Design a binder for this molecule. Structure first.
Ligand SMILES: *[C@@H]1O[C@H](CO)[C@@H](O)[C@H](O)[C@H]1NC(C)=O
Ligand SMILES: [Zn+2]
Lengths: 195, 596
């Protein structure tokens, strides 16, 4: 009963930040040491739990969230941060207990001319709640004139496309993020470290 | 909701869409400049048309948001910049007439050639033909031919166009609620929004006027020293008390006196400081020049260069059958891509030029945090000033000694300082009257103070009073000698070079004070001073987000332009020029002319 940590990190396809994928890791033993020791990850910051003592703790379920953002947006994933990614795309709670892992993927997710297949949400009526996803494609009304389902004057499409090209700087390069969320409830724990 | 919140949404959509369209034009223009081809020209023109059409469309949409109702200071600047920059309110026919006049001027300037007498088909162009003659020749009649020929062939054709160019530009500026095209140009320095103390567009004229009165002593002594030295080279054509002939000032327009250094050198026997031969012997390559430049900015605490700069830039002439535009440039492509296009050569000139353009990239790297519209210098002079301030420290004898390029036993005499300071003053100081005069004439022409009937009269009346330069040949109103310069015929302001010189030495004094430099300002090296880089980084990161008055106060502790640092920089030369200008008339007579 070994945990399928290899599939979520070593995945050929990652999702957009507005449509972040969640995978339940359960009923297995998890080696957190081999993940944190890998120098392939540029970001490995754990909030609420010590990264070194991750292998000696037990939780009920583990949630792995996957998406792609820009380089300057890896800060917006952290708890208590605000921005178009945290407010309208992916929000982490203020009492977040888990780990955030990211690494540069310019060699894979960047193409000459632009990979416009990764996209994000620019505008929204209200800010997203913790661990919430919005897949709505309804036109946004910025002015008094009604949109009536047509893109136009003061009517902007909520979802706009990231533009990743190989010549961008590290800030504007694509970054793959994997967020491990830990849950402990009054139920038998299924995810534990090899002890 | 408020129109402020409604405007923030409009600028969010602009910044996102503009960054992609500007990146396409920047990547396309880079391909033409790094691979000249008729195909790449089409891609560059098409990508640039998409950016301009989107810019001009969103400029009209920005007018729908009233500026009075916006309370946040970033958005106000972006809406204000967008509304005023594009959307010509001029008529359909006039807008095309302006483009027809604007495009024609650049063609007459770029393709206008002057033919020699006695050889009607041996005709020379400004680059590199007429520039080499006007910068190297010591013959009166040769230079007068090139001077009048350029003035008559290129200038006379531009005269009827320039009269139509002024009225069309004034009508355009009057649409943006400005007085004239000069007022429209002076809005860069307008700290319009402040509690009180808002820097006025008219105040720039006042402060610049004050600067000329403060720099006149040093210029009048430099004018007298050049005069006495030029009389040895041109014996019977220069007056001991008259103005300086125009065609003998080292360039076609008298913009820079630096090429007069062989004729005005203070101490000839003292050796120069050229390290080019040492760099060749020491195996220096293109990588060493830019990497040692990276070390200098790293020493003050400024960030390392992006790795994309090291692999995506044209730091040398590629050869490889690719035709390139070999002109030093710093590229802010628009999405973290920072490159430098330079056909470098193992020379001291290119070594200093590398620091001047890397300084722009360090500026560009710092203000990338701000929105796209606010991603530029606070005013016109801030940008190039930063590049020259860094270039001043690397040319000091200590820096060349520490880099191993200069011998440890190089003689540092007062004789060597005067030679260096005169070469600097021939370029730095000599241009300031020429710059003040050129823009004063244009400003006054736009304001209507000079009729077309007296255009050339006031041009040379001001040339004689303000610059000390006299027309070699009488010029009718059929001429347009102001337009004979690139910046005038290509719709470019010239007051940048005035203000950048003031701010440059203001930065140099402040950073050298912070670096605890012991000695004169002209031997200062800010290297290894992390405190100086901290003050510099705070200025570069701000960009146009803050008023330039507040931005300047954070580094030099002054809200205004001050010539003190520039005059104090040249104080060793001022006291030397004053002892040697004994036995010599200092000043000029407006009435004397070589044609009389
Ligand atoms: C990712 O794949 C490499 C081999 O390509 C493997 O060595 C590594 O352990 C994998 N990591 C994870 C987290 O699956
Ligand atoms: Zn420059």
């Amino acid at each position: 009963n070994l945990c399928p940590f290899g599939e979520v990190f070593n995945a050929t396809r990652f999702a957009s930040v507005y449509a972040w994928n969640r995978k339940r890791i359960s009923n297995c033993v998890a080696d957190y040491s081999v993940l944190y020791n890998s120098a392939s990850f540029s970001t490995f910051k754990c909030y609420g739990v010590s990264p070194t003592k991750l292998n000696d703790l037990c939780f009920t379920n583990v949630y792995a969230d996957s998406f792609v953002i820009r380089g300057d947006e890896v800060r917006q994933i952290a708890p208590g941060q605000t921005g178009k990614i945290a407010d309208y795309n992916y929000k982490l709670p203020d009492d977040f207990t888990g780990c955030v892992i990211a690494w540069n993927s310019n060699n894979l997710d960047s193409k000459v001319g632009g990979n416009y297949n990764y996209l994000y949400r620019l505008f929204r009526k209200s800010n997203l709640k913790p661990f919430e996803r919005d897949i709505s494609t309804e036109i946004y009304q910025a002015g008094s004139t009604p949109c009536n389902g047509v893109e136009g004057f003061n009517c902007y499409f909520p979802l706009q496309s990231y533009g990743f090209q190989p010549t961008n700087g590290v800030g504007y390069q694509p970054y793959r993020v994997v967020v491990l969320s830990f849950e402990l409830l009054h139920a038998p724990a299924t995810v534990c470290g090899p002890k | 909701s408020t129109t402020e919140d409604r405007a923030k949404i409009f600028l969010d959509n602009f910044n996102r869409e503009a960054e992609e369209l500007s990146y396409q034009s920047s990547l396309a223009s880079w391909e033409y400049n790094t691979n000249i081809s008729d195909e790449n020209v089409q891609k560059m023109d098409e990508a640039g048309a998409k950016w301009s059409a989107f810019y001009e469309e969103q400029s009209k949409l920005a007018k729908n948001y009233p500026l009075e109702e916006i309370q946040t200071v970033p958005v106000k600047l972006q809406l204000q910049i967008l509304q005023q920059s594009g959307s010509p309110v001029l008529s359909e026919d006039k807008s095309k007439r302006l483009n027809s006049i604007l495009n024609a001027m650049s063609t007459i300037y770029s393709t206008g050639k002057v033919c020699k007498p006695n050889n009607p088909q041996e005709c020379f162009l400004l680059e590199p033909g007429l520039d080499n003659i006007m910068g190297t020749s010591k013959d009166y009649n040769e230079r007068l031919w090139a001077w009048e020929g350029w003035r008559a062939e290129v200038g006379k054709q531009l005269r009827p166009l320039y009269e139509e160019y002024v009225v069309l530009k004034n009508e355009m500026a009057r649409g943006y609620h400005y007085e004239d095209y000069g007022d429209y140009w002076r809005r860069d320095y307008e700290t319009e929004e402040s509690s009180g103390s808002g820097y006025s567009r008219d105040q720039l004229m006042k402060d610049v006027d004050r600067i000329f009165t403060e720099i006149k002593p040093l210029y009048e002594h430099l004018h007298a020293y050049v005069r006495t030295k030029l009389m040895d080279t041109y014996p019977f054509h220069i007056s001991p008390t008259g103005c300086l002939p125009a065609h003998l000032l080292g360039d076609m327009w008298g913009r820079f006196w630096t090429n007069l250094y062989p004729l005005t050198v203070p101490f000839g026997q003292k050796p120069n400081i050229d390290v080019t031969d040492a760099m060749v012997n020491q195996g220096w390559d293109a990588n060493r020049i830019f990497k040692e430049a990276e070390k200098f900015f790293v020493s003050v605490g400024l960030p390392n260069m992006t790795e994309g700069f090291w692999n995506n830039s044209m730091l040398t002439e590629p050869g490889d059958g690719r035709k390139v535009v070999c002109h030093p440039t710093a590229w802010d492509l628009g999405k973290g891509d920072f490159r430098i296009k330079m056909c470098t050569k193992v020379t001291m000139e290119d070594f200093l030029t590398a620091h001047h353009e890397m300084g722009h990239i360090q500026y560009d790297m710092a203000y990338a945090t701000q929105p796209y519209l606010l991603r530029n210098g606070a005013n016109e002079g801030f940008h190039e000033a930063v590049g020259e301030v860094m270039s001043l420290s690397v040319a000091t004898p200590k820096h060349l000694k520490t880099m191993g390029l200069l011998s440890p036993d190089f003689l540092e005499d007062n004789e060597t300082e005067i030679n260096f300071l005169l070469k600097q003053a021939l370029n730095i100081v000599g241009t300031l009257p020429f710059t003040y005069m050129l823009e004063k004439w244009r400003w006054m022409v736009f304001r209507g103070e000079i009729p077309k009937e007296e255009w050339m009269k006031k041009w040379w009346e001001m040339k004689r009073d303000l610059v000390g330069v006299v027309e070699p040949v009488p010029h009718d109103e059929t001429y347009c000698d102001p337009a004979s310069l690139f910046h005038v015929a290509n719709d470019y302001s010239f007051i940048r070079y005035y203000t950048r010189t003031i701010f440059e030495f203001q930065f140099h004094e402040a950073l050298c004070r912070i670096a605890q430099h012991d000695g004169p300002l002209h031997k200062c090296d800010i290297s290894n001073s992390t405190d100086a880089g901290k003050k510099l980084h705070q200025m570069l990161s701000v960009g146009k987000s803050q008023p330039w008055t507040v931005t300047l106060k954070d580094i030099v502790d002054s809200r205004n332009m001050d010539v003190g640092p520039l005059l104090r920089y040249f104080e060793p030369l001022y006291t030397w020029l004053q002892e040697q200008n004994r036995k010599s008339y200092v000043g000029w007579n407006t009435d004397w002319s070589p044609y009389s």
